[PDB]
């Protein structure tokens, strides 16, 4: 329960915006937001190494990312689209070591 994400289920209309937060208690220097299609693996969107940076991640079109605190790190789609219907799991760690959030359902209607 180090790493929380919220809100836990999203239902949002296409169009609107969408913001999930990712929250720390593992003061770990980096944060990260994956994307879990049912039947595939977690692909990496985007990551911070810490606080003001982002980085692209492996599939990073159509989400921006913001590291405003060491201990929180926001994953945003500025316009939601049906395609991005998914589950989200944010990360925290540093070298090797990660550190899972429990998932984020999204359903973009």
Same mark, same amino acid.
């Given at each position: =329960?180090?790493? &929380? ?7 949002? $209309? ?5 913001? #999930? ?16 299609? &049912?039947?595939?693996?977690?692909? #990496?969107?985007? !990551?911070? !190494? +810490? $606080? +003001? ?11 921006? =990312? ?5 201990? @929180?790190?926001?994953?945003?789609? $500025?316009? =939601? &689209?049906?395609? @991005? *219907? *998914? ?5 925290? +760690? ?7 959030? =429990? +998932?984020?359902?999204?359903?973009? #209607?």
């Amino acid at each position: =329960a180090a790493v &929380t994400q919220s809100p836990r289920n999203k239902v949002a $209309v296409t169009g609107e915006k969408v913001t #999930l937060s990712c929250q720390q208690t593992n003061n770990h220097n980096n944060m990260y937001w994956y994307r879990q299609d &049912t039947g595939h693996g977690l692909r #990496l969107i985007h !990551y911070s !190494y +810490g $606080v +003001g940076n982002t980085e692209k991640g492996d599939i990073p079109d159509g989400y921006k =990312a913001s590291r405003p605190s060491h201990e @929180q790190f926001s994953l945003i789609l $500025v316009s =939601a &689209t049906p395609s @991005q *219907s *998914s589950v989200y799991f944010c990360a925290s +760690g540093v070298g090797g070591t990660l550190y899972f959030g =429990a +998932g984020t359902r999204l359903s973009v #209607l």
